[PDB]
Amino acid sequence: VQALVVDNGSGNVKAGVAGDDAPRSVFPSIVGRPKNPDAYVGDEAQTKRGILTLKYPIEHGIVTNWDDMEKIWHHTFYNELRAAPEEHPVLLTEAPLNPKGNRERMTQIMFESFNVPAMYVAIQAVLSLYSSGRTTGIVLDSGDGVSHTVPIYEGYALPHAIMRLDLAGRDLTEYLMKILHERGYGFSTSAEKEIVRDIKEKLCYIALNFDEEMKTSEQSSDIEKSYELPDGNIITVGNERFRCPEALFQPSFLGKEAAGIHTTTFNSIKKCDVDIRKDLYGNIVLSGGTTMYEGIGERLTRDITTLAPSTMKIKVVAPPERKYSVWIGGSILSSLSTFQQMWITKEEYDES
Amino acid sequence: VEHPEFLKAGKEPGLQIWRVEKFDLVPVPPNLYGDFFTGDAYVILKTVQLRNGNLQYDLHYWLGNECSQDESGAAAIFTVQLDDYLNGRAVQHREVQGFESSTFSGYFKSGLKYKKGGVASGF
Numbered sequence: 333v334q335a336l337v338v339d340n341g342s343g344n345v346k347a348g349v350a351g352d353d354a355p356r357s358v359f360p361s362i363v364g365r366p367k368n369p370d371a372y373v374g375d376e377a378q379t380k381r382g383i384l385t386l387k388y389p390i391e392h393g394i395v396t397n398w399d400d401m402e403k404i405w406h407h408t409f410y411n412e413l414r415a416a417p418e419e420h421p422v423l424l425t426e427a428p429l430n431p432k433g434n435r436e437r438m439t440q441i442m443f444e445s446f447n448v449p450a451m452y453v454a455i456q457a458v459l460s461l462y463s464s465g466r467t468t469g470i471v472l473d474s475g476d477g478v479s480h481t482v483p484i485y486e487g488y489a490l491p492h493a494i495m496r497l498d499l500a501g502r503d504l505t506e507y508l509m510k511i512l513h514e515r516g517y518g519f520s521t522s523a524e525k526e527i528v529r530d531i532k533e534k535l536c537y538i539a540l541n542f543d544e545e546m547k548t549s550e551q552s553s554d555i556e557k558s559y560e561l562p563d564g565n566i567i568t569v570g571n572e573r574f575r576c577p578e579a580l581f582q583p584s585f586l587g588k589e590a591a592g593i594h595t596t597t598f599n600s601i602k603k604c605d606v607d608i609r610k611d612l613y614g615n616i617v618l619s620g621g622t623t624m625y626e627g628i629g630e631r632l633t634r635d636i637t638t639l640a641p642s643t644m645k646i647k648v649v650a651p652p653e654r655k656y657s658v659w660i661g662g663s664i665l666s667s668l669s670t671f672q673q674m675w676i677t678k679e680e681y682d683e684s
Numbered sequence: 685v686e687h688p689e690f691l692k693a694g695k696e697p698g699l700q701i702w703r704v705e706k707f708d709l710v711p712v713p714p715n716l717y718g719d720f721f722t723g724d725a726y727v728i729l730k731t732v733q734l735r736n737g738n739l740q741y742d743l744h745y746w747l748g749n750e751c752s753q754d755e756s757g758a759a760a761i762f763t764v765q766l767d768d769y770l771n772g773r774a775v776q777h778r779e780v781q782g783f784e785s786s787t788f789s790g791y792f793k794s795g796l797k798y799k800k801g802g803v804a805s806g807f
């Protein structure tokens with residue numbers, strides 16, 4: 333019996349079948365309910381945003397609206413996969429540092445609302461490390477709603493050393509929307525935010541040295557690149573292409589006092605005892621859509637090398653498919669001949 | 685804990701090699717020990733008998749330059765599961781084709797060698 337693999341993202345759900353090398357269903361983690369009264373999920377809800385109120389049930393990777401989350405899972409099983417959840421094992425992912433009470437609520441819903449026969453809950457960052465072929469490393473997982481640095485030793489996350497950033501892709505989308513007002517663009521609506529998100533993914537990159545890139549981008553127009561809006565107008569973006577993702581390293585750009593992602597990775601490694609830090613520094617694994625910027629790995633290598641003791645050998649790993657590395661790790665794990673020994677069955681749960 | 689190959693793991697001093705094949709751990713014919721398919725990933729358990737009479741365990745997972753992502757992911761995961769089954773007492777080592785530790789090289793008197801090919805991906 334083939335397990336179903338569901339990665340519950342703040343921004344997008346990734347869903348598919350164990351044994352596939354990529355999720356067959358990717359859709360926005362959005363629930364729309366009538367403005368004047370039924371629920372619509374994902375892409376359906378975005379096309380009917382005029383008659384619906386749109387909500388995000390997963391905030392910063394944590395489920396915070398359980399009624400709407402159940403609509404998302406129902407949509408995943410019935411409208412995306414067309415699978416009977418009561419007839420498949422299910423691997424669900426959870427954020428690092430997800431409270432045990434949240435896990436238990438998700439377990440209760442899977443077993444008592446969807447009647448799943450067996451399930452396993454996996455930590456997202458751990459699945460990404462496995463998908464990179466590693467048992468030890470530090471995973472930098474940056475999604476739409478949350479970023480985490482997760483040290484992992486010999487297969488197990490070190491909870492005391494995990495660090496969490498509210499800074500992720502949605503903040504960078506909003507920051508691009510903001511700084512584009514310097515050129516006269518006024519993107520503000522929810523639908524225009526989607527367009528800006530796409531502008532961000534197509535045109536942004538991470539500077540190797542921000543100050544030097546400001547200088548070279550000022551000296552000519554080579555920085556400028558174009559993007560065709562859906563109405564056919566062409567937009568031109570200049571140094572916004574690298575100033576937007578620069579917030580990952582300088583959250584003060586966003587009005588945040590938080591440490592940037594290089595500092596956070598360094599602090600996370602320092603929480604682990606000295607004897608395993610070299611294995612972490614040599615296995616910094618990038619995960620998630622917001623790590624997809626061109627230039628991230630070379631820039632991260634520079635900045636962590638500056639911070640870390642010079643005896644440490646810094647190695648930043650940027651897997652090409654890292655956008656879905658969580659889901660792929662879940663696909664591998666739940667295909668293994670030993671998966672049936674790791675899961676919790678409905679009969680066990682119902683009699684606990 | 686119920687996988688047949690887990691039940692055989694680490695009972696006696698010696699060298700045990702499994703290859704990842706279609707999301708399973710499959711024992712490598714002993715005649716082929718030392719020769720690794722570059723298209724594949726393997727798990728290697730070295731068991732040593734101490735003066736104590738207790739056993740020390742070293743788990744290496746070896747990744748070929750052309751092995752597929754299901755094979756290297758499964759090799760990592762199986763390595764963790766075998767360690768757990770061994771009560772957490774194995775030391776885990778990641779071995780990349782052409783950059784293997786001298787400990788791992790030292791397990792094979794004829795040296796490490798590589799072959800073209802491999803078993804098909806599970807993906």
Ligand SMILES: Nc1ncnc2c1ncn2[C@@H]1O[C@H](COP(=O)(O)OP(=O)(O)O)[C@@H](O)[C@H]1O
Binds near residue numbers: 343344345
């Ligand atoms: N090529 C890209 N460059 C930069 N950001 C990207 C790229 N692709 C996706 N993203 C961003 O990654 C975020 C979604 O990543 P994901 O890891 O799926 O998040 P989640 O798991 O929280 O839903 C979004 O903000 C999206 O815009």
Ligand SMILES: [Ca+2]
Binds near residue numbers: 725750803
């Ligand atoms: Ca192979």
Ligand SMILES: [Ca+2]
Binds near residue numbers: 486774
């Ligand atoms: Ca161990």
Ligand SMILES: [K+]
Binds near residue numbers: 393474
């Ligand atoms: K994330």
Ligand SMILES: [K+]
Binds near residue numbers: 637638639640641642
């Ligand atoms: K340094």
Ligand SMILES: [Mg+2]
Binds near residue numbers: 340341342475620658
């Ligand atoms: Mg995610």
